[PDB]
Amino acid sequence: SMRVDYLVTEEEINLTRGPSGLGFNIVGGTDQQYVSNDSGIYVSRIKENGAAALDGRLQEGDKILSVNGQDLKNLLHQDAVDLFRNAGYAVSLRVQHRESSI
């Protein structure tokens, strides 16, 4: 049973909220099909000195698959925003790091 990937492209990241939030910006959603050829919620910016920045693992361009196990597929942009806001202090993200079609 493989529990170690040759290439680590997907990752679970456990963040804790700071005073300014989780410390990243998102784009995407079912109402933002123009953003990507692979619809979902993406990290557009890691905020300088914020929670996500200090933690080190989240990257700009990450696709966030789920928050606390809740799939972000099928969500409007605003519905994703509300989810993050509703997630409490500790937040578990499952992400797919950037992968480019050539």
Ligand code: NA
């Ligand atoms: Na940050």
